């Protein structure tokens, strides 16, 4: 952490955080969502970490270079150590990334290397080559080299994610999957595991072997698993929790910002809330109907009267504050609501749907209060501005996902959050063979612009093709964007070091400190 001149430190440097949900795994190769990544970033550290603005900086790797964006060479600092005091080497990274790639590890994030274009990854993931053919290699103990099959100019931007952090070979071979038990585990991040009582709490304490330990200030952090937003706020207001989880109860929120306005922290966040349209299902396969739904939704109401938390009305999929985005607001976004509604109604009438023979479709959302309150306000805004008939259907999270992949829905509620701060985090999900394309958006013009970003070396010219990819999605009206999330949470005023400036929200407890209070 960097403690400001003049700040007085409390004598107990301990922190309590709400992590919104139990963590299933501490194994980098097995984690999947935000709760597990939160804990993972205090325990393990990969080549690069996110700074205060959410830009890659030095983590294990003290410097790196590339030759054509296709060979990458990371110089690892010499004092990086595991908590048993042994060195972190390049060998740990060669091992780790091979274990992430192996189909037998079945990592939820094995595909993250395919975003990087590591040589032979596709053959590895299909089982056609052994994992030891990945193009990674240890030139010596302190020099790791990654060979790609295509230039990927922003490949370093991916290396902050927890999946690409190293795992200790020694403990992996020897304990197999028991390696992450409090007696076997060995970590290389600022913190180490003191205690893990499942569904109750995870307690980390400083790792004195961490290379940057002289700056760590908090000695112990507790992540709780409170899945109820209300209870989060209450326990926080009782003084047991210093920093809630980032989902704020709509109702409660309004009270909280009246009553404890300096502790309500609201900052931009790299997630977009949208309604995904099933692009392959008539009559949603007609671009005029998709446009109509895009145009008549009134984002203002949603964001300023239903939600009212500072979210920004969206007009694209990638959020405009993504690093490397230079988007243009489309013309339709400036029109008034009335002009939008008049045009949407004309578009529907052309496709054969009027007040007398309305579009009627289902609006699928995953069971939850936020989404249901959104789905209701949206069903009603659409009924009034456009004369359609919308039926609300809710499914449980796993059925919901499976229904979206299967393509048996009309319109669905959806959210996407970047894993790294670069537009292809969002845009790769609409590539026509993507695995995350649950809009069933198939567009060769879109796929070609994205492929061209790999061949452009200038960042500003790269950011021009991303803008065109966004304008192509907009023209196809593949989805309906609603808003860009804000990251809202309660943070005690004695929690120093919280800037709210990293739009990924990659908080490292090593950077906070408790102010005397």
Domains located in the chain, CATH noted: 1-44+169-270+487-517 (3.40.190.10), 45-168 (3.90.76.10), 271-486 (3.10.105.10)
CA neighbor of 479 nearest in space, from 399, 421, 415: 415
Cα–Cα distances in angstroms (integers) from residue 177 to residues 30, 33, 106, 147, 185, in the given order: 10, 19, 13, 29, 10
Q: Using CA atoms, how far apart are residues 484 and 187, in angstroms rounded to an integer? A: 35
Burial code (b: 16+ CB inside 10 Å, e: under 16) for 485-506 equals bbbbbbbbeebbbbebebbbbb
Inter-residue contact 296 to 338 (CB < 8 Å): no
CA neighbor of 159 nearest in space, from 28, 296, 275, 46: 46
- A 10 A CB-CB count for 428 gives 16
Q: Which residue has the tokens 């009924």?
A: 383
Phi then psi for residue 131, to 5 deg, are -60, -25
- The pair of structure tokens assigned to 380 is 């009603």
Q: Which residue has the tokens 């989880």?
A: 245
CA neighbor of 306 nearest in space, from 375, 402, 399: 375
**Exposed (0-12), middle (13-18) or buried (19+): which is 517, by Cβ within 10 Å?**
exposed
HSE-up of residue 52 (Cα within 13 Å, Cβ side): 7
Category of 118 on φ-ψ map: left (φ > 0), alpha (ψ -120 to 50) or beta = beta
- A 10 A CB-CB count for 461 gives 11
Q: 3-class SS at 312? A: strand
Q: Obtained via which technique?
A: X-ray
Phi then psi for residue 56, to 5 deg, are -55, 135
- The pair of structure tokens assigned to 199 is 């569904």
Q: Which residue has the tokens 């407890």?
A: 509
Inter-residue contact 400 to 371 (CB < 8 Å): no
Resolution reached, in Å? 2.4
Q: What does the DSSP 8-state code read for residue 104?
A: G
CA 433 to chain centre: 21
Q: Which residue has the tokens 């910002």?
A: 257
Q: Which residues, 6 or more positions from 323, have their beta carbon under 8 angstroms from its beta carbon?
A: 54, 55, 157, 421, 422
Q: Which residues, 6 or more positions from 281, have their beta carbon under 8 angstroms from its beta carbon?
A: 407, 409, 410, 440
Cα–Cα distances in angstroms (integers) from residue 275 to residues 317, 375, 438, 514, in the given order: 11, 10, 11, 41
Q: Measured in Å, how far apart are the chain's first and last C-alpha atoms?
A: 18
Q: 3-class SS at 274? A: strand
Inter-residue contact 194 to 202 (CB < 8 Å): no
């Amino acid at each position: 952490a960097d403690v400001p001149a003049g700040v007085q430190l409390a004598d107990k440097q301990t922190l309590v955080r709400n992590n919104g949900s139990e963590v299933q795994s501490l194994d980098p190769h097995k984690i999947e969502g935000v709760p597990e990544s939160n804990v993972s970033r205090d325990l393990f550290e990969g080549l690069l970490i996110s700074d205060v603005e959410g830009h890659p900086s030095p983590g294990v790797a003290e410097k790196w270079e590339n030759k054509d964006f296709k060979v990458w060479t990371f110089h690892l600092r010499e004092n990086a150590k595991w908590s048993d005091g042994t060195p972190v080497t390049a060998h740990d990274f060669v091992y780790s990334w091979q274990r992430l790639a192996d189909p037998n590890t079945a990592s939820p994030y094995a595909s993250y290397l395919q975003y990087g274009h590591i040589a032979n990854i596709d053959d590895i993931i299909a089982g056609k080559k052994p994992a030891t053919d990945l193009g990674v290699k240890a030139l010596d103990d302190h020099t790791f080299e990654v060979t790609l099959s295509e230039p990927v100019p922003y490949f370093y931007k991916l290396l902050v994610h927890p999946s690409v952090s190293p795992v200790p070979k020694s403990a992996v071979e020897k304990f197999g999957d028991k390696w992450t038990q409090p007696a076997n585990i060995v970590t290389n991040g600022a913190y180490k595991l003191k205690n893990w009582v499942v569904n109750e709490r995870i307690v980390l304490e400083r790792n004195p072997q961490y290379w940057d330990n002289a700056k760590t200030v908090i000695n112990q952090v507790t992540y709780l698993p409170i899945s109820s937003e209300v209870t989060d706020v209450n326990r926080y207001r009782s003084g047991e929790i210093d920093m809630t989880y980032n989902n704020m109860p709509i109702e409660l929120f309004q009270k909280l910002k009246k009553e404890i306005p300096n502790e309500v922290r609201v900052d931009p966040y790299l997630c977009t809330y949208y309604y995904e349209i099933n692009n392959q299902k008539a009559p949603f396969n007609d671009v005029r109907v998709r446009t109509a739904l895009k145009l008549a939704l009134d984002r203002d109401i949603i964001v300023n009267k239903v939600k009212n938390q500072g979210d920004l009305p969206a007009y694209s999929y990638t959020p405009p504050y993504t690093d490397g985005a230079k988007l243009v607001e489309p013309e339709w976004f400036k029109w008034s609501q009335q002009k939008r509604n008049e045009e949407a109604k004309k578009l529907l009438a052309e496709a054969g749907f009027t007040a007398d023979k309305p579009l009627t479709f289902d609006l699928l959302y995953n069971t939850s209060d936020l989404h249901k309150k959104l789905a209701i306000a949206v069903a009603s805004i659409w009924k009034k501005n456009l004369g359609v008939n919308v039926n609300l259907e809710n499914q449980e999270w796993k059925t919901f996902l499976d229904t979206r992949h299967q393509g048996t829905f009309d319109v669905a509620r959806a959210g996407w959050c970047a894993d790294y701060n670069e537009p292809t985090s969002f845009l790769n999900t609409m590539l026509s063979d993507s695995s995350n394309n649950t809009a069933h958006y198939k567009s060769p013009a879109f796929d070609k612009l994205i492929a061209d970003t790999l061949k452009v070396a200038d960042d500003t010219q790269r950011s021009e093709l991303y803008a065109k990819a966004e304008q192509q999605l907009d023209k196809d009206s593949a989805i309906v964007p609603v808003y860009y999330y804000v990251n809202a949470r309660l943070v005690k005023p004695w929690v120093g070091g919280y800037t709210g400036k990293d739009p990924l929200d990659n908080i490292y407890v090593k950077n906070l400190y408790i102010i005397k209070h």
